[PDB]
Design a protein around this ligand. Structure first.
Ligand code: A1BMS
Ligand code: A1BMS
Lengths: 269, 268
């Protein structure tokens, strides 16, 4: 992969692997989310971020700060087939003192048509205390060197799905998958649960009949608290709806502490 | 990925991804196992096997036959770092009427040095009845077209680890991880549990202390019975020792064996 000509965005191509695809022989939304995170890591490395797994700036290391995900939003028009080449372009934007945004466009390598788009919100956290904070002047200056200074949105529309408020599912849930736990393959190189794991866990409470007869079009996931290596998760889903819509809650199996909430939109094949 | 000059083996290069590595920023044995499976599928495709995810020959489709894994054996000398290029060469061989073997050699793309090797045994199964059988004359003839006819072994050494008989672990186990369940990411395109998942389940019952202070050098896994999508698995481990362990996966309810294996670990 490479920075584009102007050095303000990054492009990489991926061949879809045998083990990356579901029943339709097309890439899972989990495979898509891993590729988004891979190209994001390759971009961060190319613009001089830390290579220690935390992807920090100089100022962030000095102040013991990290980025954590607040939200991930993916819309897929066409899942790439097994052996297909997908091209993903990604860039970052500063959002004042609130946080930062990473955006992605997915294209068919052969046709050059857009097959999906994604957006993520990141907030600043002290690594030691785990307390959220605002972005410092010095960090905002670091982001000016490698981000477009005019707005560039994967989701430009002024009232678009990627920014909708998500309500909290009320008991009883319509469907549930209980006693979900992470294994070592679910952890990143710093022994935190991979953000993509939480996508899989949400989808586990979707009935197999939906997955068999629908394609996932849109997923919006809010991240509230991280699952520790030794935590156990319950995944809850209620139908809110030819298109199927669902409300999602992940919560700790014991005390019912919220870790994530989300929505999915599915269209019949 | 390409067939080599003689058309009797296949080579592919892989860049190690961010999410593929563990805590020393080198590829997990699970990442290695997924890459072995991927170059295996790419080779099968290049020599005219089915593209429906069952990777069958013409006479296998006629007879409703599939290959199932009996054994996977992997030895790693160096795990490739995050963003390193690993080159993997793979080939197949007939073992008379017993079954077939797929072998792999892993190389550092930059040095050309061997960083690991693996071998796997495959047995014929009727897809409908799930009954094991011998290889037909007609299937053995199909394998003559794309396999070396002289022996080529990733593990040549007569009486090597890759062919050792594995005993059944006796209760009580020294270590256990219980209530393991597959999710959709654990299934292949035909909704069978990915063979690599079973490797991860085996390793779940190794203490975090071992994984933190040792590197995995060798893993030998026998496959006895498939975990179904709605099954639950217990992973059991006992120290037999370098650290060496004996492994058992069994169904959480009735204790039906699904896999047994051994691991050998070297202090870092
Ligand atoms: C300036 O780049 C930082 C970055 O992208 N780092 C990530 C950890 C967040 C977005 S990610 O998940 O793609 C990888
Ligand atoms: C002609 O080769 C068939 C083949 O390789 N097929 C696999 C399914 C078994 C070995 S695998 O796991 O590498 C892929």
């Amino acid at each position: 992969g490479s920075l584009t000509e102007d050095g303000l965005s990054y492009k990489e191509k991926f061949v879809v692997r045998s083990y990356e695809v579901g029943s339709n022989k097309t890439a899972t939304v989990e495979t898509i989310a891993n590729l988004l995170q891979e190209v994001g890591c390759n971009h961060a490395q190319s613009v001089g971020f830390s290579t220690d797994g935390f992807a920090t700036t100089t100022t962030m290391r000095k102040l013991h700060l990290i980025w954590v995900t607040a939200r991930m939003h993916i819309e897929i028009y066409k899942y790439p087939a097994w052996g297909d080449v997908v091209e993903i372009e990604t860039w970052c934007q500063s959002e004042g003192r609130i946080g930062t945004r990473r955006d992605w466009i997915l294209k068919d390598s052969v046709t050059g048509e857009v097959t999906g788009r994604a957006t993520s919100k990141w907030v600043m956290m002290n690594q030691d205390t785990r307390r959220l904070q605002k972005v410092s002047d010095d960090v905002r200056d670091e982001y000016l060197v490698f981000c477009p200074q005019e707005p560039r949105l994967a989701f430009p529309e002024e009232n678009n799905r990627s920014l909708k408020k998500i309500p909290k599912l009320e008991d009883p849930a319509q469907y549930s998958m209980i006693g979900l736990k992470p294994r070592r393959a679910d952890l990143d190189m710093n022994q935190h649960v991979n953000n993509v794991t939480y996508i899989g866990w949400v989808l586990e409470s979707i009935p197999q009949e939906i997955v068999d007869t629908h394609e996932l079009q849109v997923i919006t996931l809010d991240y509230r608290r991280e699952c520790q290596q030794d935590d156990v998760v319950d995944s809850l889903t209620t139908t809110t709806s030819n298109d199927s819509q669902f409300l999602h809650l992940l919560r700790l199996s014991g005390d019912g502490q919220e870790i994530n909430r989300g929505t999915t939109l599915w269209r019949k094949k």
